[PDB]
Amino acid sequence: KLLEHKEIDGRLKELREQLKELTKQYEKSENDLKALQSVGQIVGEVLKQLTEEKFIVKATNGPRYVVGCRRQLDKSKLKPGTRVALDMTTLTIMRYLPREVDPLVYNMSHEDPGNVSYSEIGGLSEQIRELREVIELPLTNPELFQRVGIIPPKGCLLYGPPGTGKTLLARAVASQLDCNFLKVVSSSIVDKYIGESARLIREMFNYARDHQPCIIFMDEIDAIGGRRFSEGTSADREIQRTLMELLNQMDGFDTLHRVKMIMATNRPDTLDPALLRPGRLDRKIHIDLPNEQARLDILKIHAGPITKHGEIDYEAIVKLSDGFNGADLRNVCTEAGMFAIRADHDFVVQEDFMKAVRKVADSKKLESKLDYKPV
Amino acid sequence: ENSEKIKVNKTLPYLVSNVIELLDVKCAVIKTSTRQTYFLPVIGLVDAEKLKPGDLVGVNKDSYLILETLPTEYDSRVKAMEVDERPTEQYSDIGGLDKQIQELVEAIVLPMNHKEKFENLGIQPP
Amino acid sequence: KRFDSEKAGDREVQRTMLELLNQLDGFQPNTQVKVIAATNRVDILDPALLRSGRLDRKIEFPMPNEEARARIM
Numbered sequence: 001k002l003l004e005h006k007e008i009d010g011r012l013k014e015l016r017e018q019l020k021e022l023t024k025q026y027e028k029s030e031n032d033l034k035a036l037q038s039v040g041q042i043v044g045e046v047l048k049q050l051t052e053e054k055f056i057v058k059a060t061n062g063p064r065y066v067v068g069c070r071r072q073l074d075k076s077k078l079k080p081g082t083r084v085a086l087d088m089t090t091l092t093i094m095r096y097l098p099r100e101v102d103p104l105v106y107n108m109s110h111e112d113p114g115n116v117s118y119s120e121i122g123g124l125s126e127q128i129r130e131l132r133e134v135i136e137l138p139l140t141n142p143e144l145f146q147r148v149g150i151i152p153p154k155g156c157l158l159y160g161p162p163g164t165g166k167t168l169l170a171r172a173v174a175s176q177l178d179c180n181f182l183k184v185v186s187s188s189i190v191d192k193y194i195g196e197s198a199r200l201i202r203e204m205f206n207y208a209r210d211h212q213p214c215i216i217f218m219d220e221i222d223a224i225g226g227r228r229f230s231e232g233t234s235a236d237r238e239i240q241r242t243l244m245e246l247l248n249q250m251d252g253f254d255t256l257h258r259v260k261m262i263m264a265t266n267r268p269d270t271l272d273p274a275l276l277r278p279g280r281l282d283r284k285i286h287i288d289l290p291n292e293q294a295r296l297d298i299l300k301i302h303a304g305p306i307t308k309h310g311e312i313d314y315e316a317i318v319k320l321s322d323g324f325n326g327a328d329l330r331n332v333c334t335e336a337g338m339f340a341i342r343a344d345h346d347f348v349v350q351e352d353f354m355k356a357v358r359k360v361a362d363s364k365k366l367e368s369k370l371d372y373k374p375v
Numbered sequence: 376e377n378s379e380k381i382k383v384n385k386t387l388p389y390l391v392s393n394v395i396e397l398l399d400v401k402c403a404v405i406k407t408s409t410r411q412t413y414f415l416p417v418i419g420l421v422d423a424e425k426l427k428p429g430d431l432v433g434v435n436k437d438s439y440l441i442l443e444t445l446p447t448e449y450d451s452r453v454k455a456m457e458v459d460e461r462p463t464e465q466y467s468d469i470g471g472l473d474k475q476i477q478e479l480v481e482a483i484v485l486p487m488n489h490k491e492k493f494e495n496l497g498i499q500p501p
Numbered sequence: 502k503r504f505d506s507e508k509a510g511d512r513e514v515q516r517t518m519l520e521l522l523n524q525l526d527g528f529q530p531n532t533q534v535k536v537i538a539a540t541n542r543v544d545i546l547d548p549a550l551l552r553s554g555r556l557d558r559k560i561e562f563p564m565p566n567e568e569a570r571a572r573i574m
C-alpha cells in the first residue's frame with residue numbers, strides 16, 4: 001500500500017551489502033590459485049647458434065647445454081651474450097631477458113636521502129669549480145671540448161687531511177646534477193667468494209655503460225686499492241685482482257665513454273702507482289684544512305640554526321682554531337650547545353662558544369697531524 | 376581453494392632464496408641458496424611491491440615460487456653480542472670518575488631520553 | 502694506524518676499520534645508534550678514527566689521585 005516494503009527495504013540492503021563484499025575476495029583468491037601452476041625457469045646466456053633449432057647455452061649455475069628454441073620467440077634477438085630463460089624439464093629457450101642488475105648495484109644507486117646543497121660545503125669554493133669541470137661541463141656542452149681537441153678528463157681523486165670536506169662535497173653533487181650517480185663504500189664490494197669481488201666491478205661499469213651520463217663515486221679507496229704487495233698473503237692477491245679489474249676498466253682496450261669517476265681517500269700514498277697515473281685519475285683535488293677566511297665561513301653554516309642570543313662573535317673562534325679541519329669546527333658548535341644545555345639554558349651565548357673552542361682544541365692534541373700527500 | 380592453497384604451503388620445507396631483480400616486463404628473478412638462478416613468471420603468494428631487490432624470500436622446493444617474505448637475517452655472531460641479562464652495577468659503584476661519568480651520561484643517555492631538548496636548541500647530539 | 506709498505510703487510514684488518522669509519526659517519530647521517538669505545542693506547546689509533554664526526558667526546562680517565570683511592574676501597 002502506501003508504505004509497502006519501502007521501510008523494510010533498508011534491512012535487506014544492509015544484509016546484501018555485507019554478503020556481497022565476501023564474494024569479492026573469492027575472485028582475488030582464484031588469482032593466487034592460477035599462479036600455483038607456474039614453475040620457474042633456469043637462467044643462462046646464449047653462446048652460439050649451431051642451427052636454427054639448436055643453441056649452445058650455459059646455465060648461470062652449472063654446465064653448458066645444447067637446447068632448442070621456442071618457435072614463437074624471434075631468432076634474431078638471441079645474439080651471443082643474451083640472457084635467456086630455459087625450461088626446467090626440457091631445456092628450451094622461452095624468453096630473451098634484459099641484462100641483469102646485481103642487487104648490490106641496485107642498492108648502490110638508490111641511496112642518498114641527505115640532499116646536501118652547495119651552500120653547506122663552505123671554504124671549498126675553488127675545489128668545487130675544479131671538480132665540476134670534470135663532471136658537469138663535459139656532460140652538458142661536449143661541443144666546447146671538440147673545438148680545442150682535448151678529451152675531457154675521466155677520473156678525479158679527492159684527497160686531504162682526515163676531516164676536511166671530501167664526502168660532503170661528493171654528496172653535494174649526489175644531491176644535485178641530473179645523471180645516474182653510483183655511490184659505493186669501496187669496501188662493501190669485496191666478499192669471500194673466489195670471484196664475486198671482481199664480478200661486482202664488472203657489473204658496476206656494465207651498468208654505468210648501459211646507463212649513460214653516470215658517475216661512479218668510489219668512496220675510501222685504500223681498501224680495494226693498495227700497493228700490490230710482492231710476497232703478500234693468500235687472501236691478499238685476490239684483492240689485488242679486483243684492483244687489476246677496476247684498473248683495466250678505467251683505461252683499457254675499450255675506452256669508457258660518458259662515465260666519470262670520483263674517488264676519495266685520506267691517505268693517497270698507499271695507492272698503487274697505476275691508479276694514480278694520469279688517464280685513470282687525471283685531476284687530483286687536494287681538499288685541505290680551511291684557511292682563516294674559510295674557517296669563518298665554516299662556522300656560520302653549522303652555527304646558524306642555533307637559538308643564539310647576543311653579539312655572537314665568529315671572529316673570536318677563528319683565531320683560536322688553527323688546524324680545526326672540518327668537524328671540530330662543527331664540534332665547536334655542537335659542543336657549545338652541550339655547555340649551554342648544562343645550566344638548563346635554552347640560551348646560547350658567546351662565552352659558551354668560546355668555552356667549547358678550547359675543549360675541542362684540547363681533545364685534538366692526541367691526533368697525529370700528518371700531511372700524507374700522493375706521489 | 377584454501378585446502379589446495381595450503382597443500383603447496385603444507386610442504387613446509389622451503390628453499391630460502393634472495394630476490395635479484397624484480398623485472399616488470401610483474402615478474403621476479405631469484406637466486407636460490409644453491410647457486411641457481413630462476414625467472415619465476417608469477418611472483419606467487421606475495422605482493423609485487425613488498426618485494427624489493429635483495430629481500431629474503433622462501434621458495435617451494437620443487438616448483439620454485441615465492442611463498443613468504445622471511446624477516447631479515449643477521450650473522451649468528453652479531454646476534455650473540457646483544458646483551459639480554461643487564462649487568463647490575465649502579466653509578467654509585469664507580470668512584471672518583473664523577474666529572475667523567477656525568478660527561479658520558481649527558482652524551483649517550485640524556486640525548487636518548489630528552490630529544491625534546493636538543494631539538495628546541497637545534498644542536499645535533501654528539 | 503694505517504701503514505704504507507711494499508713486500509707484505511696487513512690490510513685485511515684495515516678494511517674492517519675502513520668499513521667502521523664509513524658506517525659511523527659516511528654518506529648516511531645515522532643519528533640513533535650511539536657508539537662508545539674503550540681504549541688504553543690512543544697513540545696507536547688511526548688519525549681517521551679520532552675525528553669529530555666519528556667518536557667525538559674523547560674522555561680522559563686518570564688514575565685516582567688521593568681520594569678516589571679512598572672511595573675506591
Ligand SMILES: Nc1ncnc2c1ncn2[C@@H]1O[C@H](COP(=O)(O)OP(=O)(O)OP(=O)(O)O)[C@@H](O)[C@H]1O
Pocket residue numbers: 120121122123124161162163164165166167168169220264265266298301302325326327330526527552554
Ligand atoms: N666546508 C664545510 N662546510 C660544512 N661542513 C663541513 C665542511 N668541511 C667539513 N665539514 C664537516 O665535515 C663532516 C664530515 O665530512 P666528510 O665525511 O665529508 O669528511 P672526511 O672525513 O674527509 O671524509 P671521508 O672519510 O668519508 O673520506 C661533515 O659532517 C661536515 O659538517
Ligand SMILES: [Mg+2]
Pocket residue numbers: 161162163164166167266
Ligand atoms: Mg674523511
Ligand SMILES: [Mg+2]
Pocket residue numbers: 244245246247248249
Ligand atoms: Mg689495469
